[PDB]
Each structure stands twice: as structure tokens, then as C-alpha cells.
Amino acid sequence: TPDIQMTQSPSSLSASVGDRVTITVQASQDIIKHLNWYQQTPGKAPKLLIYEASNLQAGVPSRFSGSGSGTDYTFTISSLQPEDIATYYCQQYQSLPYTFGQGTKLQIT
Amino acid sequence: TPDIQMTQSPSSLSASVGDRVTITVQASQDIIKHLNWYQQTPGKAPKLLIYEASNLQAGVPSRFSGSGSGTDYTFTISSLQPEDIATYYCQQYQSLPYTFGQGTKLQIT
């Protein structure tokens, strides 16, 4: 009944080029693999990188990767390119309404 | 097979407080009522206003409203509050991967 609440962390980070970035999310319930991870550059519609918790979209570099099960899932950027600076989102599609995470915003030092 | 492409218009508009705003989207296929309209204020995770093409989320003022069928759908803001200044998105959930529209960005004169 209540919308599956989605807990994303961190709310924001800073790393350096070549750094290993990992972003995690906890789900209020077992949303099974129904999780879309999106990327969103400033002033651009969101860009789906991963769906079904682990499959890459099309075009999407190997850098990015997603794992996890049930309630807890992880999004990992292997190396981090300067292009990679963005805000990263997640969304459950396990049950209407499909809910979004608060979002993690990548940042460089 | 190919991701349902989603055609949203306009890509950007300007109106005044009290103005009647309507935003339309064409779908590459009959995505049936599987359309989430989202709102997204600057620097904030997207905010779902409507799902199933026409049902309001929770909290969401009556101002907003959504209709349409098959491929063509319309999102309408009855009056337009200054709070309403944002970028508006849409997404099909009729078939994986759930695709986003280019997005309409509201704007005031």
C-alpha cells in the first residue's frame, strides 16, 4: 500500500578522476530487480544507464555497473571520468507509483 | 523491440501567472496509460505529479491534470503559480526500458 520508500546514499560526494565511486540504495521493500539507475547532467533530461538493477543501457560505457538484490542495491563507477560529473538517481518500478531516490550528486576536488 | 521513443512539446515555454499551460507528448507506440509525468525544481530530485496518465499523486494541487490515450497524451496546468516554474518530464512505463521525454521547461515573462 504505501509507496515503496527508497533510501539513497550518499546525498552528495566529492572524488577525483580515476577514483572508484560506489553509490548505494536501500529499498523499503524487496523491489526485486526493478530498479532504474539514471544519470542527469545539468540542464538535460535524465539519462538511463541501468535497468533491472544490473543491465547497462545502450551506449553506456563499461565504467558504470549495478548489482544487489531485494532491498539493497549498489551502483558503482569503476574509474570516474570528468564527464562523469553529474547527479545520479535511482527508481523502483516494482510497484506504482514508481518512486525516485533523493539522488547522489557527484563532485570533483 | 526498439525502446518506445517519446516526443514531448514544447521543449520550452514562457507564460505568465494565471496563464493556462498545456504540454503535449506523442508516443512512438500505444504506451497505453503507462505514463508518469514528473516535475523537477532546480537542484531537487524529480517529483511525480501524475501516473497512469491521469491520476494525481499525493499532495499535488488540483491545478495539474493529465489526459490522453494510446500514443498521444496531454499534461495541463490550469492556472500556473510562481512555484510552478520548473522543468516538466514524462516517462513511459509501458515497456522496458522505461523512457523519458526530452522535457518541457516552464518559464515566466
Side-chain angles (χ1 to χ4, degrees), chain A residues 4-16:
Chain A
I4 280 163
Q5 318 256 238
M6 296 261 283
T7 295
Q8 227 199 295
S9 214
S11 325
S12 135
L13 83 100
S14 269
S16 294

Side-chain angles (χ1 to χ4, degrees), chain B residues 2 7 11 17 23 25 39-40 44 47 51 55 60 65 67 69 71 74 78-79 81 85-86 94 100 107:
Chain B
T7 295
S11 325
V17 181
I23 289 150
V25 61
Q39 157 197 50
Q40 142 154 129
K44 322 295 143 124
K47 198 223 181 113
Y51 57 103
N55 15 10
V60 286
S65 77
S67 96
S69 351
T71 61
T74 331
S78 131
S79 196
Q81 313 299 6
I85 276 203
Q94 206 273 133
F100 254 89
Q107 163 168 305

Side-chain angles (χ1 to χ4, degrees), chain B residues 32-94:
Chain B
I32 335 171
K33 316 292 229 216
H34 307 310
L35 180 80
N36 288 130
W37 286 98
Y38 292 95
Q39 157 197 50
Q40 142 154 129
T41 111
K44 322 295 143 124
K47 198 223 181 113
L48 176 80
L49 309 175
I50 289 181
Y51 57 103
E52 287 302 83
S54 33
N55 15 10
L56 280 256
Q57 230 288 255
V60 286
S62 35
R63 212 176 319 118
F64 315 83
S65 77
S67 96
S69 351
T71 61
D72 316 332
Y73 301 88
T74 331
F75 164 82
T76 269
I77 289 147
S78 131
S79 196
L80 199 84
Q81 313 299 6
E83 324 112 46
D84 289 335
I85 276 203
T87 266
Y88 291 70
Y89 290 108
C90 81
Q91 151 185 56
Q92 62 96 7
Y93 44 92
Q94 206 273 133

Side-chain angles (χ1 to χ4, degrees), chain A residues 3-82:
Chain A
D3 331 339
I4 280 163
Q5 318 256 238
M6 296 261 283
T7 295
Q8 227 199 295
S9 214
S11 325
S12 135
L13 83 100
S14 269
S16 294
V17 181
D19 294 32
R20 215 280 214 322
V21 166
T22 119
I23 289 150
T24 147
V25 61
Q26 212 210 277
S28 116
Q29 329 177 184
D30 179 3
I31 84 226
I32 335 171
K33 316 292 229 216
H34 307 310
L35 180 80
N36 288 130
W37 286 98
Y38 292 95
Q39 157 197 50
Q40 142 154 129
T41 111
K44 322 295 143 124
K47 198 223 181 113
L48 176 80
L49 309 175
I50 289 181
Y51 57 103
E52 287 302 83
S54 33
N55 15 10
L56 280 256
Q57 230 288 255
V60 286
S62 35
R63 212 176 319 118
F64 315 83
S65 77
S67 96
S69 351
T71 61
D72 316 332
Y73 301 88
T74 331
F75 164 82
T76 269
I77 289 147
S78 131
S79 196
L80 199 84
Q81 313 299 6

